């Protein structure tokens with residue numbers, strides 16, 4: 265059997281590999297190279313431009329924290345935007361909230377969406393929900409054009425190399441801020457604390473120039489570089505996102521595999537070296 | 546340049562790799578294969594039987610949590626035992642406590658100790674401390690023979706394949722229990738929550754058969770499989786190890802890079818799937 269390996273200039277000198285049971289699909293779409301394969305131990309794996317986006321074994325860790333962190337802090341969220349997130353993992357978690365009225369998803373690459381519908385049916389199942397509306401568009405342009413404002417915005421992007429190039433700048437957080445309700449929250453995928461604090465520093469800096477409260481949380485997920493990924497958390501009130509306003513006790517949240525009330529707040533308890541680096545921002 | 550790769554039957558179907566700047570030393574000792582190399586991005590790396598034991602970039606995460614968790618809960622610890630731990634990382638952290646009177650280390654493989662003294666001088670520096678006493682012995686036999694009892698025992702072992710074979714059974718936790726003071730604490734390296742809950746379940750089961758309070762904490766560390774490792778925490782009182790009794794505010798702890806008062810307790814906030822698996826043990 266062969267092995268897939270995740271090399272990148274974004275994490276030089278290290279690489280994570282998964283044994284391949286079989287390659288399921290590959291293509292060059294309008295924007296990126298798409299790879300789907302079945303791994304021997306992590307289930308099916310989605311890859312974009314050589315970077316692991318998810319695996320069936322551990323995606324829940326990432327999708328549950330990215331979603332249920334802002335959604336338990338927002339009191340009655342009605343309209344939620346997902347930026348990127350073509351696989352539908354965030355949507356899957358968003359749909360569990362009966363009180364949500366609309367879920368917009370702006371994903372640049374329709375291939376990702378259709379690939380997920382075909383090969384990742386237990387992840388993309390939320391596309392069947394009547395509240396979900398899909399826009400195939402660069403979120404950079406979508407956010408300039410959108411007339412609605414949102415309670416929660418979840419930025420579930422790929423990395424800064426590729427189409428997500430436009431989602432990691434000062435201009436982009438303006439657009440996020442303006443597209444939010446005056447008491448609105450945004451969470452974004454942010455680097456690993458273990459590999460580039462510089463990037464994390466830059467993001468927090470862009471966010472703090474508009475947002476009253478900017479926090480950073482960490483998620484354990486084995487198939488992202490360094491075994492973890494951060495959540496750039498953005499609030500318009502000084503109350504922030506570290507503390508949930510509700511508990512997910514209805515039958516829809518019975519299946520949660522990572523998120524709970526306690527680990528919500530825990531995710532915000534960062535290694536000493538990290539706290540130190542971000543303090544004078 | 547070449548790459549070092551960590552393959553194992555203990556985590557099949559996955560592998561982590563580091564680019565090699567240069568190989569520094571290799572040998573077959575009485576017990577295991579030893580590899581020291583300089584990596585391109587993680588500094589010097591120690592490998593035993595093909596398994597990464599530490600790297601200069603991230604070892605602090607592991608050594609600080611393994612040490613300062615029990616040492617901030619034990620009120621006036623005087624005599625501490627390190628099982629395994631030949632690199633001296635735990636000793637380095639133990640030495641920061643002025644109140645410690647004795648530090649015994651039982652390490653089976655003297656080669657590891659001397660290799661660390663030569664190639665990892667900023668990790669093994671605590672061997673120069675007059676309180677540190679070294680026993681080259683299987684901790685399985687050492688614990689049967691020792692006449693002293695300890696306030697804290699830190700089990701800083703390699704994995705169950707190799708000489709640490711004898712440190713992962715019911716008999717071994719008897720010995721730990723008996724070698725502890727009646728209000729004594731033991732922490733042990735335990736699996737990754739992401740790869741074998743079975744092992745974790747087995748360890749907690751052995752510990753609970755003797756110890757009043759058995760807890761499990763998780764540490765973020767990129768160069769262990771799945772990017773994390775657990776601490777099997779064992780207490781003789783129902784109070785446990787989740788809550789520190791002191792704050793590390795003296796100039797000796799000024800250099801801490803991971804541990805702090807808040808993330809002590811945070812480490813014990815586990816993913817939902819894990820809590821579920823261990824509940825009826």
Ligand SMILES: CSC[C@H]1O[C@@H](n2cnc3c(N)ncnc32)[C@H](O)[C@@H]1O
Pocket residue numbers: 312317347348349350351370371372373376401402403404420421422426427428429430431
């Ligand atoms: C797999 S989930 C991450 C998604 O982010 C999408 N993405 C990257 N850049 C942008 C952008 N500028 N606008 C919308 N979606 C994007 C990628 O196509 C990917 O499907």
Ligand SMILES: CSC[C@H]1O[C@@H](n2cnc3c(N)ncnc32)[C@H](O)[C@@H]1O
Pocket residue numbers: 593598628629630631632651652653654657682683684685701702703707708709710711712
């Ligand atoms: C590198 S720190 C981990 C150490 O645990 C040591 N070790 C493994 N098994 C045993 C044992 N039975 N007794 C003492 N030390 C051990 C290994 O030699 C290694 O140096």
